Design an enzyme around this catalytic site. Structure first.
Site, PDB file in Angstrom:
ATOM      1  N   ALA A 128      19.879 -15.821   7.355  1.00  0.00           N
ATOM      2  CA  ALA A 128      20.452 -16.570   6.918  1.00  0.00           C
ATOM      3  C   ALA A 128      21.353 -17.945   7.205  1.00  0.00           C
ATOM      4  O   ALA A 128      21.540 -18.971   6.754  1.00  0.00           O
ATOM      5  CB  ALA A 128      20.636 -16.428   4.824  1.00  0.00           C
ATOM      6  N   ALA A 173      22.004  -4.970  11.399  1.00  0.00           N
ATOM      7  CA  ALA A 173      21.878  -4.037  10.249  1.00  0.00           C
ATOM      8  C   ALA A 173      20.931  -3.073  10.164  1.00  0.00           C
ATOM      9  O   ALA A 173      20.861  -2.599   9.449  1.00  0.00           O
ATOM     10  CB  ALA A 173      23.480  -4.413   9.528  1.00  0.00           C
ATOM     11  N   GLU A 190      17.533  -5.143  -0.893  1.00  0.00           N
ATOM     12  CA  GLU A 190      17.789  -5.760  -0.934  1.00  0.00           C
ATOM     13  C   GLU A 190      18.912  -5.714  -2.215  1.00  0.00           C
ATOM     14  O   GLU A 190      19.927  -6.270  -2.368  1.00  0.00           O
ATOM     15  CB  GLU A 190      17.115  -7.131  -0.920  1.00  0.00           C
ATOM     16  N   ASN A 248      16.373 -24.442   3.735  1.00  0.00           N
ATOM     17  CA  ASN A 248      16.700 -25.249   3.785  1.00  0.00           C
ATOM     18  C   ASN A 248      17.036 -25.964   4.460  1.00  0.00           C
ATOM     19  O   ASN A 248      18.972 -26.588   4.078  1.00  0.00           O
ATOM     20  CB  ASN A 248      17.300 -23.984   6.125  1.00  0.00           C
ATOM     21  N   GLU A 301      41.147 -26.680  -5.262  1.00  0.00           N
ATOM     22  CA  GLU A 301      40.394 -27.800  -6.031  1.00  0.00           C
ATOM     23  C   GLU A 301      39.227 -27.409  -7.153  1.00  0.00           C
ATOM     24  O   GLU A 301      38.942 -27.343  -7.977  1.00  0.00           O
ATOM     25  CB  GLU A 301      40.264 -29.756  -5.973  1.00  0.00           C
TER      26      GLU A 301
HETATM   27  N1  GTP Z   1      17.582 -19.686   2.530  1.00  0.00           N
HETATM   28  C1  GTP Z   1      16.844 -19.189   2.966  1.00  0.00           C
HETATM   29  N2  GTP Z   1      17.103 -17.542   3.426  1.00  0.00           N
HETATM   30  C2  GTP Z   1      17.174 -17.007   3.798  1.00  0.00           C
HETATM   31  C3  GTP Z   1      16.720 -17.279   5.503  1.00  0.00           C
HETATM   32  N3  GTP Z   1      16.927 -16.154   6.598  1.00  0.00           N
HETATM   33  C4  GTP Z   1      17.064 -14.830   5.708  1.00  0.00           C
HETATM   34  N4  GTP Z   1      17.121 -15.023   4.206  1.00  0.00           N
HETATM   35  C5  GTP Z   1      16.873 -14.285   2.833  1.00  0.00           C
HETATM   36  O1  GTP Z   1      17.882 -13.365   3.492  1.00  0.00           O
HETATM   37  C6  GTP Z   1      17.292 -12.255   3.102  1.00  0.00           C
HETATM   38  C7  GTP Z   1      18.056 -11.358   4.399  1.00  0.00           C
HETATM   39  O2  GTP Z   1      19.365 -11.312   5.327  1.00  0.00           O
HETATM   40  P1  GTP Z   1      18.709 -11.775   6.261  1.00  0.00           P
HETATM   41  O3  GTP Z   1      19.972 -12.647   7.046  1.00  0.00           O
HETATM   42  O4  GTP Z   1      17.538 -12.149   7.527  1.00  0.00           O
HETATM   43  O5  GTP Z   1      19.807 -10.765   7.084  1.00  0.00           O
HETATM   44  P2  GTP Z   1      20.665 -10.511   8.221  1.00  0.00           P
HETATM   45  O6  GTP Z   1      21.739 -11.016   7.309  1.00  0.00           O
HETATM   46  O7  GTP Z   1      20.308 -10.930   9.613  1.00  0.00           O
HETATM   47  O8  GTP Z   1      21.074  -8.959   8.457  1.00  0.00           O
HETATM   48  P3  GTP Z   1      20.538  -7.896   9.355  1.00  0.00           P
HETATM   49  O9  GTP Z   1      19.748  -7.153   8.454  1.00  0.00           O
HETATM   50  O10 GTP Z   1      21.581  -7.234  10.791  1.00  0.00           O
HETATM   51  O11 GTP Z   1      19.530  -8.900  10.328  1.00  0.00           O
HETATM   52  C8  GTP Z   1      16.273 -12.417   3.246  1.00  0.00           C
HETATM   53  O12 GTP Z   1      15.734 -11.994   1.783  1.00  0.00           O
HETATM   54  C9  GTP Z   1      15.244 -13.721   3.340  1.00  0.00           C
HETATM   55  O13 GTP Z   1      14.492 -13.993   1.949  1.00  0.00           O
HETATM   56  C10 GTP Z   1      16.527 -18.929   5.335  1.00  0.00           C
HETATM   57  O14 GTP Z   1      17.088 -19.197   7.343  1.00  0.00           O
HETATM   58  N5  GTP Z   1      17.130 -19.432   4.256  1.00  0.00           N
END
Ligand code: GTP
Ligand code: ACP
Ligand code: GDP
Ligand code: CA
Ligand code: CA
Ligand code: MG
Ligand code: MG
Ligand code: MG
Lengths: 423, 338, 438, 54
Positions: free
Chosen positions: C12, C99, C183, C228, C254
């Site tokens: 994300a 992870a 989550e 995004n 700020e």
């Molecule tokens: N808005 C948005 N949310 C995202 C995106 N990619 C993943 N998410 C959200 O992130 C959450 C999962 O976390 P991730 O960032 O995909 O997992 P990670 O940080 O790579 O950690 P790992 O478990 O090691 O894969 C989910 O709720 C997804 O909906 C993105 O590109 N845009």
């Protein structure tokens, strides 16, 4: 690149494993000679998860074929894709196991397990980042059940931080070879309870009913039963073999599907199951996917509650309609989903459908109704064990009655553990 | 198949609504803590509004307006009427009230109390909160409080004859998700069997029209009407025979005016027009009628019961306009426009 | 001029970061190869845009950013993306295995082995800064890396950069697009560990962005790319004050001063408007009053909640495009007499307003239509606690059965950290109710 | 409404509108907990290998 090492042991394991590699090879565009002839880069994006690449742009399945008899492995090497397997990865003995768990686990199997681990080590060493193993085997025989669980215990010892996943065929009197299958299955289930993270429970009783009732096959053969298993194995591994967001590797699947370490036995389901050119709408795929008649474990989901569920839709379809139908199934039958695991149903969609189908759906449920399968085996086990029938086949190999009593107690515990979370 | 949950087993109105929803074959009841519901017959206290409207693929409706307590709490109602410019401070349909803590209006309450006493006007006030006291001495009221509200006790109430007896009017109002204001065509007068005696305020049986107090502390309970409840058909006939007027002209116009005024005032604060969940609510307005045929608002109940004879018709109306409007299946109200 | 370093953690954080830096380049006229024609000072400078971009002798404007992910596939797209030339290898950090949606796995097991490498790379960018302000940290709540490793990085950043400020852009989990059942666990675990190390955090609920995309952009099934693009617009309007000439929110300090009087309550609510579909030729351009009124509609908020049943502690209005103060005050007067806006007794009832004349920039061919004026409201309202309540409820449901807890203990985390983190969220919900309820 | 602190530049302006007036852990401590979790993993794995050795 998160590699998976595939292992198939025994007659059942090698015949189902062979069909599996024949199926996914066609999907990924690999021909019997290891050459790729596909028309889409989605086929190769994650090909490394199951295939090694050799000189000349050849793809070699990362598969190890194991058996205590050479028979079935000779058929595989003569089968359609027999030439695609690595010759050094054929590990077989000559004595056999005689449908005897003790022989596969303690005597005949112990003599051959080291050479299997040597091949596993060679495959693991050439893995950029091995993520785990998947084993295909039956629980009612001797090699896949007895030596298969021995292999799993020794693989865990050498790779304690890797995921262990199995496709385990459960025995059934409807499709039985010997009367000792409940013994072999009960002894193996305890091994699986401790030394696997994910086990797909493939019930031969269900596979037969589906062929007889639904598919209208008057005299189902093992080939017919295995046709259903190939389709299910291809479906449940779709999220591992193609680009995706949900359950894309073995560890993330375990985290989504296994809330308690011992309750990791899944009910697979597939749709459609047609006796064949008619397009199947998304609502039809969804309702059939959840219909017990499409379950491969021979357990009534309405007799228990779903802890977690993983759904995979394959083909070109409306993802908006997929979400609506999935939400419709849960919201209309919310009583069958435990309320203490919010949003326990996850859905994935893959554009590439399986061969011969415009659309398909694969169901992977962790339901407390799976206890019906273990109860069934426990009853058959006790029916003979109360009279110590057929025990001499096992005590003649060094086993003691106490080990049977303990395996019996362990599986009843598993049944009780499912029942506690169903309430 | 619509789904709903029940979280207020003590609600007689919605126990009947629930029974009707099931009798339609198209509604299914879930466990009280199941989140995949279309409708919530929620609890009266600490209803988790913050957890509504976050279920994908579910249109969610609840039977309470978040923030409606401002109107349904005596102290809140007084503060709302005084501070709201729409209601101003000089609105003629609400008795002069003051909020007194045991901010505070103690000093202001005594200021107006002196002006009337000096002028010889009646200084009979009543203290109550969310057991009351009726006295003509401000000192006795304050001692009784030691949050409470002190409003002018109406000394010249309209008395039903025969009996020379007091009464109050209860009106049921249903506000749907679109904020349409529906006044139930049927009302109920909760009468006092004892004759009104302005001499002894301590004998509160004739002064309090509560249905519970009349049946417990009064000897003439049920003498004139069954359950000290006079419905609009009879009350209208009485007004025509005794006063030569109708219920609609003399009282109902003022009631509709008061209902519109109160509900429109808080509409910006509680409307679920563009919210991720929708709300409706059944309200119970209580009015006093003085001898000049002027209507006064007493209080507003957010969780009211219904008259036994009216549960069927009213509860069906709730399903028709409030529930089926959002979840259609396969008038008894007066729409107060605005 | 003081520099700001951006840190993107997990899928994300990385994908959102990729979208933000694409928008930055479009806004500042930085071509994909790093060249900036309008920049007359070659190889150096202390302009407003230099707070986010450094300069090489060859005229390349390099983002002051670090991308960290425990899996290589997500960052590899940055290495081969349109703006690959902007970044150099030292900025992109990847591991072998992720992870697995396990906070403990990302915080303890994998975090311990890669934290020193990340900090060292961050130190490289810090060494280039004449006066570093702090860090902007993009990550998700639900991912194992975004939650587990971020909380570890935030702890260490407080150690190595004690005087620096740290801002968060956190993605709040929504089941419509979520990928893990646990989550809620990761969300509450990382909020507990990061709470004392973040000066100001902007939560974005995927549910809200998802419905905004479906409702206002006519997207049937919005993708991460759709989400995004819209998130990068919000993030841009928030950071524009740091990248352009102005007087409001000119440094990270700020943000805390204008939005966070109570340190623990450092989660301002973001409301953006207008969001117009680009698939329609002509759309009636909304006025200053109309887009300002939209800032008080829950349907336009980054987190669905009801500010009416809460209290404001601070409120900033960030305009971009054709906007003059006269129109802002006129719209506020009207809205004030038609909306339910209540401030806490101990805070002034007012608005801090910032106007940048350059209208919002949109990715060519994207889904957002170009508008003549837009606004992003940053309001610290107690109503955002509704998001905490939802999250804490789902946490309680699973934890009562110890569901999935074994995955975390298996990574070395103690079961007590669960209740410890949950007790902190309980205190947080209590703080909000005290500040905004009577 | 009072408008205060109006600042103008070529690229925009900012101001404030008032409607109504009012009425850390050390590096050592972190490494300990990280090492503590790592030791609990080592212990749990040691018990597994002991179990498998049996
Ligand atoms: N808005 C948005 N949310 C995202 C995106 N990619 C993943 N998410 C959200 O992130 C959450 C999962 O976390 P991730 O960032 O995909 O997992 P990670 O940080 O790579 O950690 P790992 O478990 O090691 O894969 C989910 O709720 C997804 O909906 C993105 O590109 N845009
Ligand atoms: N200002 C006033 N003047 C005259 N009578 C009054 C009055 N305030 C209250 N009463 C009498 O007191 C009775 C009950 O008062 P009130 O409604 O405040 O208490 P309550 O909340 O327990 C009953 P409910 O919930 O049905 O309204 C009324 O029926 C009315 O007859
Ligand atoms: N589905 C399926 N089940 C099989 C097949 N072959 C054997 N079985 C089942 O497996 C059990 C016998 O085990 P088997 O594999 O023959 O013993 P092994 O070779 O020693 O491992 C019985 O319950 C059979 O019903 C097969 O090809 N397909
Ligand atoms: Ca320059
Ligand atoms: Ca700090
Ligand atoms: Mg056999
Ligand atoms: Mg009352
Ligand atoms: Mg990831």
């Amino acid at each position: 690149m998160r590699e998976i090492v595939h292992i198939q042991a025994g007659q059942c394991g090698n015949q189902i494993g062979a069909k599996f590699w024949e199926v996914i090879s066609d999907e990924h565009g690999i021909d019997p000679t290891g050459s790729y002839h596909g028309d889409s880069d989605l086929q190769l994006e994650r090909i490394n998860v199951y295939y090694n690449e050799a000189t000349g742009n050849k793809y070699v399945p990362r598969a190890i074929l194991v058996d205590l008899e050479p028979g079935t492995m000779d058929s595989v090497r003569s089968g359609p894709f027999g030439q695609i397997f690595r010759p050094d990865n054929f590990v077989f003995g000559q004595s056999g196991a005689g449908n005897n768990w003790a022989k596969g686990h303690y005597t005949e199997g112990a003599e051959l397990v080291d050479s299997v681990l040597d091949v596993v080590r060679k495959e693991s060493e050439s893995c950029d980042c091995l993520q785990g193993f998947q084993l295909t085997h039956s629980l009612g025989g001797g090699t896949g059940s007895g030596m298969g669980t021995l292999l799993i215990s020794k693989i865990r010892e050498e790779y304690p931080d890797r995921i262990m996943n199995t496709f385990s065929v459960m025995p059934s009197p409807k499709v039985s070879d010997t009367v000792v299958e409940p013994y072999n299955a009960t002894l193996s289930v305890h091994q699986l309870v401790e030394n696997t993270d994910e086990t797909y429970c493939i019930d031969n009783e269900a596979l037969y009913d589906i062929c007889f009732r639904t598919l209208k096959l008057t005299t189902p053969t093992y080939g017919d039963l295995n046709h259903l298993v190939s389709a299910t194995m291809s479906g449940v591994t779709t999220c591992l073999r193609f680009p995706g967001q949900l359950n894309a590797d073995l560890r993330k699947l375990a985290v989504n599907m296994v809330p308690f370490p011992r309750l990791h036995f899944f009910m697979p389901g597939f749709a459609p199951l047609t006796s064949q050119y008619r397009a199947l709408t998304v609502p039809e795929l969804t309702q059939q996917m959840f219909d017990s008649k499409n379950m491969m474990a021979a357990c009534d989901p309405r007799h228990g509650r779903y802890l977690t569920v993983a759904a995979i839709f394959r083909g070109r379809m409306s993802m908006k309609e997929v979400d609506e139908q999935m939400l419709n199934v849960q919201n209309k039958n919310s009583s069958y989903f435990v309320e203490w695991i919010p949003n326990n149903v996850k859905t994935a969609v893959c554009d590439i459908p399986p061969r011969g189908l415009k659309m398909s759906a694969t169901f992977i449920g962790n339901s407390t109704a799976i206890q019906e399968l273990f109860k069934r085996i426990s009853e058959q086990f006790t029916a003979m064990f109360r009279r110590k029938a057929f025990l001499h086949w096992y005590t003649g190999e060094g086993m003691d009655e106490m080990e049977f009593t303990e395996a019996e107690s362990n599986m009843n515990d598993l049944v009780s553990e499912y029942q506690q979370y169903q309430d | 198949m619509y789904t709903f949950v029940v979280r207020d087993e003590n609600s007689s109105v919605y126990a009947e609504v629930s029974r009707l929803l099931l009798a339609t074959g198209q509604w299914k009841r879930l466990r009280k803590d199941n989140p995949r519901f279309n409708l919530m017959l929620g609890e009266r206290n600490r209803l988790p509004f913050g957890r509504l409207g976050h279920e994908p693929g579910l249109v969610q409706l609840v039977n309470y307006y978040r923030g409606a307590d401002k109107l349904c709490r005596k102290a809140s109602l007084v503060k709302l009427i005084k501070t709201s410019p729409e209601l101003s401070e000089s609105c003629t349909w609400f008795p002069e009230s003051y909020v007194i803590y045991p901010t505070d209006e103690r000093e202001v309450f005594l200021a107006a109390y002196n002006r009337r006493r000096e002028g010889r006007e009646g200084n009979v006030w009543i203290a109550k909160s969310s057991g009351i006291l009726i006295s003509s001495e401000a000192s006795e009221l304050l001692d009784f409080i030691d949050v409470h509200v002190i409003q002018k006790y109406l000394e010249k109430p309209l008395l039903l004859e025969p009996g020379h007896r007091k009464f109050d009017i209860r009106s049921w109002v249903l506000v749907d998700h679109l904020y349409n204001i529906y006044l139930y065509r049927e009302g109920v007068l909760r009468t006092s069997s004892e004759p009104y005696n302005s001499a002894n305020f301590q004998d509160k049986t004739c002064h309090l029209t509560n249905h519970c107090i009349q049946k417990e502390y009064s000897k003439n309970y049920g003498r004139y009407e069954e359950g000290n409840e006079m419905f609009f058909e009879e009350f209208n006939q009485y007004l025509m025979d005794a006063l030569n007027t109708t219920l609609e002209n003399s009282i109902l116009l003022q009631i509709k005016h008061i209902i519109r005024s109160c509900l429109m005032c808080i509409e910006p604060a509680i409307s679920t027009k563009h919210l991720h969940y929708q709300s409706f609510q059944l309200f119970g307005f209580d009015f006093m009628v003085d001898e000049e045929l002027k209507v006064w608002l007493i209080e507003v109940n957010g969780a009211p019961a219904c008259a036994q004879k009216l549960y069927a018709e009213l509860c069906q109306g709730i399903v028709d306009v409030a529930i089926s409007s959002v979840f259609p299946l396969a008038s008894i109200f007066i729409k107060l426009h605005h | 001029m003081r520099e700001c370093i951006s840190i993107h953690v997990g899928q994300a954080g990385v994908q959102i970061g990729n979208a933000c830096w694409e928008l930055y380049c479009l806004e500042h006229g930085i071509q994909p190869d790093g060249q900036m024609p309008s920049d007359k000072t070659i190889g150096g400078g202390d302009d407003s845009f230099n707070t986010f971009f450094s300069e090489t002798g060859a005229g390349k404007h390099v983002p002051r950013a670090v991308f960290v992910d425990l899996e290589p596939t997500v960052i590899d797209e940055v290495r081969t993306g349109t703006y690959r030339q902007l970044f150099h290898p030292e900025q992109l950090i990847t591991g072998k295995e992720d992870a697995a949606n396990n906070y403990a796995r990302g915080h303890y097991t994998i975090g311990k082995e890669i934290i020193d490498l990340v900090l060292d790379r961050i130190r490289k960018l810090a060494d280039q800064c004449t006066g570093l302000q702090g860090f902007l940290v993009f990550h998700s709540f639900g991912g194992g890396t975004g939650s587990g490793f971020t909380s570890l990085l935030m702890e260490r950043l407080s150690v190595d950069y004690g005087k620096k400020s740290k801002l968060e852009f956190s993605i709040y989990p929504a089941p419509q697009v979520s990928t893990a059942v646990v989550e809620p666990y990761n969300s509450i675990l990382t909020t507990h560990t990061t709470l004392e190390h973040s000066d100001c955090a902007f939560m974005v609920d995927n549910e809200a962005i998802y419905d905004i995309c479906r409702r206002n952009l006519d997207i049937e099934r919005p993708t991460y790319t759709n989400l995004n693009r819209l998130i990068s617009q919000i993030v841009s309007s928030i950071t524009a004050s740091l990248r352009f000439d102005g007087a409001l929110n000119v440094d990270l300090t700020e943000f805390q001063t204008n939005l966070v009087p109570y340190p623990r309550i450092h989660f301002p609510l973001a409301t953006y408007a207008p969001v117009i579909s680009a698939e329609k030729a002509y759309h009636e351009q909304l006025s200053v009053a109309e887009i300002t009124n939209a800032c008080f509609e829950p349907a336009n908020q980054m987190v669905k909640c009801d500010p009416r049943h809460g209290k404001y502690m601070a409120c900033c209005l960030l305009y971009r495009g054709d906007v003059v103060p006269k129109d802002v005050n006129a719209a506020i007067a009207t809205i004030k007499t038609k909306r339910s806006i209540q401030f806490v007794d101990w805070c002034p009832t007012g608005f801090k307003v910032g106007i940048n004349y350059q209208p919002p920039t949109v990715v060519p061919g994207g889904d957002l239509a170009k508008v003549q004026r837009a606004v992003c409201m940053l309001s610290n309202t107690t109503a955002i606690a509704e998001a905490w309540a939802r999250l804490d409820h789902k946490f309680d449901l699973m934890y009562a059965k110890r569901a999935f807890v074994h995955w975390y203990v298996g990574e070395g985390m103690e079961e007590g950290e669960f209740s410890e983190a949950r007790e902190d969220m309980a205190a947080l919900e209590k703080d909000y109710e005290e500040v905004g309820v009577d | 409404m009072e408008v205060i602190e109006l600042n103008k530049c070529t690229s925009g302006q900012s101001f404030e509108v008032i409607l109504k007036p009012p009425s850390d852990p050390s590096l050592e401590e972190i490494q300990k907990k990280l090492e503590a979790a790592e030791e609990r993993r080592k212990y749990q794995e040691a018990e597994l290998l002991k179990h498998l050795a049996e």
